[PDB]
């Protein structure tokens, strides 16, 4: 998975509970 601040292909491509918003970042809403 991609870590914080890395570009994301999709939400589940991001590590932790991060979501995809251009980059892997935690949004307000939990995508997972």
From Swiss-Prot:
Tissue-specific expression: Expressed by the venom duct.
Transmembrane region(s): none
Entry's localization field: Secreted
Domain of life: Eukaryota
Note on domains (UniProt): The cysteine framework is XI (C-C-CC-CC-C-C).
Family: Belongs to the conotoxin I3 superfamily.
Annotated function: May embed in the membrane and bind to the voltage sensor domain of a ion channel. Does not induce paralysis when injected in fish, leading to the hypothesis that it may be part of the sedative nirvana cabal.
The protein's name in its UniProt record: Conotoxin G11.1
Coverage span on the entire protein: 46 to 77 of 77
């Amino acid at each position: 998975c991609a870590v914080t601040h890395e570009k994301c292909s999709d939400d589940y491509d991001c590590c932790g509970s991060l979501c995809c918003v251009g980059i892997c970042a935690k949004t307000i809403a939990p995508c997972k």
